[PDB]
Amino acid sequence: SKARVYTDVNVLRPKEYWDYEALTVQWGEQDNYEVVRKVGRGKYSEVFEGINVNNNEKCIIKILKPVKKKKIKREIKILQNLYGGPNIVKLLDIVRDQHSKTPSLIFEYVNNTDFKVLYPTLTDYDIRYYIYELLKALDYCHSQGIMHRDVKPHNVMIDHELRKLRLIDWGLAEFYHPGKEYNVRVASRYFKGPELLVDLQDYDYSLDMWSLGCMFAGMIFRKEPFFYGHDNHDQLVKIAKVLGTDGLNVYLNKYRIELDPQLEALVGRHSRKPWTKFINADNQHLVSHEAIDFLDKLLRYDHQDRLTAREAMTHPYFQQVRAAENSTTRAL
Numbered sequence: 252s253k254a255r256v257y258t259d260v261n262v263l264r265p266k267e268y269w270d271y272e273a274l275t276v277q278w279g280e281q282d283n284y285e286v287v288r289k290v291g292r293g294k295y296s297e298v299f300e301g302i303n304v305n306n307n308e309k310c311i312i313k314i315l316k317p318v319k320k321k322k323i324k325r326e327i328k329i330l331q332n333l334y335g336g337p338n339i340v341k342l343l344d345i346v347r348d349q350h351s352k353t354p355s356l357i358f359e360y361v362n363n364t365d366f367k368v369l370y371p372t373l374t375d376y377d378i379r380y381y382i383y384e385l386l387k388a389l390d391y392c393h394s395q396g397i398m399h400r401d402v403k404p405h406n407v408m409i410d411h412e413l414r415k416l417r418l419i420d421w422g423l424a425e426f427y428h429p430g431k432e433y434n435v436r437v438a439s440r441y442f443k444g445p446e447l448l449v450d451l452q453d454y455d456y457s458l459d460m461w462s463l464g465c466m467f468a469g470m471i472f473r474k475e476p477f478f479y480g481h482d483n484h485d486q487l488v489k490i491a492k493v494l495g496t497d498g499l500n501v502y503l504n505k506y507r508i509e510l511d512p513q514l515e516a517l518v519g520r521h522s523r524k525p526w527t528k529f530i531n532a533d534n535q536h537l538v539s540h541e542a543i544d545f546l547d548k549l550l551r552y553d554h555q556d557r558l559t560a561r562e563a564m565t566h567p568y569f570q571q572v573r574a575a576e577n578s579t580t581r582a583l
């Protein structure tokens with residue numbers, strides 16, 4: 252398998268663009284940034300609101316727990332390569348404390364609201380807007396030869412008053428090289444695409460579109476996480492109990508994949524459940540024919556059949572936001 256879009260971006264860039272192990276980090280001065288308060292704990296990073304003591308601007312400080320220097324360099328190189336892209340978090344500095352040498356990334360601050368608080372206050376056209384903004388970030392990173400690999404609400408910061416969206420946490424992101432066999436232990440369980448769950452290692456940007464689909468289903472149906480498996484095997488089972496096993500078997504045959512025997516037994520046999528089955532009185536105001544059609548075109552087993560991010564932006568679901576922003580670029 253090879254990506255059907257942005258296939259060859261990395262050979263159209265100098266070697267130094269993607270060869271992150273060769274990066275030499277130019278460290279800033281740690282004493283320029285003061286921690287103000289904690290905002291979150293990740294598995295191996297800690298995130299603080301900070302202040303730049305020189306220009307007094309707010310910032311976010313991400314302190315990275317030891318992981319291979321290869322991984323720190325990968326995250327830094329990706330953030331540098333994506334700097335200035337639409338709805339991408341902006342990396343402002345790279346510092347480390349004098350004594351422990353633990354690295355910290357300095358970002359531009361975003362006034363986020365927790366999705367558990369924010370999403371219940373979003374109406375139909377708010378969802379259309381923010382998904383469109385997320386698609387702009389994914390199309391951009393894909394166009395620059397990068398797959399995020401951890402798309403989920405927790406990695407999408409939103410300043411709702413300023414309608415500002417930033418795609419964050421590039422620590423699992425990778426460069427796409429056609430033919431490359433990647434680690435399938437990426438993303439977070441509930442957002443993993445079927446390719447990861449069946450050990451299809453030569454996956455591509457389209458992984459991120461499955462993850463987006465999961466996020467989107469969770470929003471419009473108010474069922475989050477939408478696919479709630481108790482382990483990586485059961486994650487496939489939860490997907491198969493919605494999409495059905497007939498489509499799974501077609502997919503496995505196309506890509507010449509032999510399903511693990513234990514996994515095959517766990518998946519069993521299931522009919523496809525129509526998307527309308529998830530509609531209820533509480534969520535119905537968020538569902539339209541256009542939302543269902545868009546969702547259906549994201550959540551497909553076959554990664555090569557999913558909408559790309561740029562194709563998604565053309566879908567009728569986004570008619571209004573697309574027309575509104577096109578007007579402003581004309582005025583520019």
Ligand SMILES: Brc1cc2nn[nH]c2cc1Br
Nearest residue numbers: 298311358359360361419
């Ligand atoms: Br807001 C915000 C929160 C973050 N957590 N991890 N990285 C982050 C960057 C920004 Br900006």
